[PDB]
């Protein structure tokens, strides 16, 4: 089912749609087609989801 990624650099959500992430975190990439710039991700460990800037995520 799930496309995976690894977070490269810390990012703090500034808007309610965004997801705060830490360098090294594992995510699921829920969508990367609506925008090359904003990907919807879900943290494996917490289950929280939101948008992150795409350059913060390295697909696995
Ligand atoms: Na994209
Ligand atoms: Pt901050």
From Swiss-Prot:
It is found in: Nucleus; Cell membrane; Endosome membrane; Cytoplasm, Cytoskeleton, Actin patch. It comes from the Eukaryota. Phosphorylated by PRK1. Residues 4-60 form the SH3 domain. Component of the PAN1 actin cytoskeleton-regulatory complex. Interacts with ABP1, KRE6, LAS17, LSB5, RSP5, RVS167, VPS1 and YSC84. Component of the PAN1 actin cytoskeleton-regulatory complex required for the internalization of endosomes during actin-coupled endocytosis. The complex links the site of endocytosis to the cell membrane-associated actin cytoskeleton. Mediates uptake of external molecules and vacuolar degradation of plasma membrane proteins. Plays a role in the proper organization of the cell membrane-associated actin cytoskeleton and promotes its destabilization. Belongs to the SLA1 family. Present with 952 molecules/cell in log phase SD medium. This is Actin cytoskeleton-regulatory complex protein SLA1. It comes from Saccharomyces cerevisiae (strain ATCC 204508 / S288c) (Baker's yeast). The chain holds residues 357 to 413 of 1244 of the full protein.
């Amino acid at each position: 089912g799930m496309e995976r990624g690894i977070v490269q650099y810390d990012f703090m959500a500034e808007s309610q749609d965004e997801l705060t992430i830490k360098s090294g975190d594992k995510v699921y990439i829920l969508d990367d087609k609506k925008s090359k710039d904003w990907w919807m991700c879900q943290l494996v460990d917490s289950g929280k989801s939101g948008l992150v800037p795409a350059q913060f995520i390295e697909p696995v």
